[PDB]
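Please predict the structure of the following assembly.
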Amino acid sequence: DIVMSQSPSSLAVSAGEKVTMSCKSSQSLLNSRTRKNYLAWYQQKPGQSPKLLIYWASTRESGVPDRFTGSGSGTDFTLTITSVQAEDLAVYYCKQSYNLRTFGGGTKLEIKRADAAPTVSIFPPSSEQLTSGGASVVCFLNNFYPKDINVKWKIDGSEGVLNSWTDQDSKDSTYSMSSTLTLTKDEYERHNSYTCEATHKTSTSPIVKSFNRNEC
Amino acid sequence: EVKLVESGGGLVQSGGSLRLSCATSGFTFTDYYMSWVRQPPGKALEWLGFIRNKANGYTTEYSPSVKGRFTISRDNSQSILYLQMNTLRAEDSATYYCARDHDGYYERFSYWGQGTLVTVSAAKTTPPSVYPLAPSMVTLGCLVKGYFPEPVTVTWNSGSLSSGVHTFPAVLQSDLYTLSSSVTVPSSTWPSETVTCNVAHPASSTKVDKKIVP
Ligand SMILES: C=CCO[C@]1(C(=O)O)C[C@@H](O)[C@@H](O)[C@@H]([C@H](O)CO[C@]2(C(=O)O)C=CC[C@@H]([C@H](O)CO)O2)O1
Ligand SMILES: [Mg+2]
Ligand SMILES: [Mg+2]
Ligand SMILES: [Zn+2]
Ligand SMILES: [Zn+2]
């Protein structure tokens, strides 16, 4: 059959640097009839559809930046991005169309940027949820880098939690993360202080945000 | 302007069937092969099959992963592409894209639709509960809690607030999804001006506006 393989699985590059990525096919994609390689590259930005960048191995689609260049022949192909931009954050796929079509497994390009501390916000449960017997406390850890981060919840001073990180931001190359603590109303009502504490490598001091139920 | 727009995805039980459509415009439909490609959440693109152009008899081909079980057809009067899916299984859960394919000259998929999400599950449809997240700059949110299946859409001020917005990917917990969205605006602008999250959950036809009130 025709097996398409890509490398690396993922890598991160700083804005302005060069990105190199590879695509292999189990058999030659060089069509003897037209003497072209039936190999195309697609870019898929977070939560977007794939978009054509390059086809016939090296032909850059109109509207696609000069910084994207496809190369290689036969079984081996390379996508090169010079002077990478923040907006270039995406999974990049190669695809043969020599015999039906087959996509490679993709290469995830992340953007390296300077370390940035998160902005932390805590939100008490809404009365419209409380009416119903539940109490979700939410903390946003917004616009930080790098991705690793620790969140602790403290209720009246001591430590049902859902965490979610966003994809990397296509503009400032930051990540954000939400932490949601869900309690019953009966349990929420037993305690006064609710605290989320974010520890990130940007500071040895956790960022602490809190509210007290008596102050609501 | 070339347009492709898939519809028809949502929740279906194991063993059931489902038919997707892809409305096209802006190009000579019959000149073109058309393909379907799917993508399970967080995974790679998978080519599924194509239907050829007029010059080639509108014949069909399929990946072995789906041959015998999926069927591609086309309406040449209305420029609509179809995918018939039968005997669906868990692994068929995915975003389905239609893409414009070969014209006899170029080797490329030039255009792709926005995608339609198919979920294969025995779980019931459950609409979301939508809760406000209120406390130089101020960060507000909406919590979109306890829904199934994916997806939901979240906008802010019917889309006029687009900068300083992010939506946190949904997390599945005990058979339901929850997600949240943040919006950051100048504190001189809220609560003095209105901030509202607009939430839709197509599977239950849920439409919600939630004003963030101080
Ligand atoms: C129009 C015929 C073939 O086009 C396809 C196809 O299977 O429909 C689709 C194309 O994307 C491409 O994969 C070609 C494949 O390259 C075979 O096409 C040629 C060839 O390149 O040798 C071209 C012309 C005639 C054809 C066969 O010799 C007879 O149909 O081969 O396949
Ligand atoms: Mg307790
Ligand atoms: Mg056959
Ligand atoms: Zn207590
Ligand atoms: Zn055939």
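The longest strand of chain B covers residues 137-147. Chain B touches chain A through 46 residues (CB under 8 Å).
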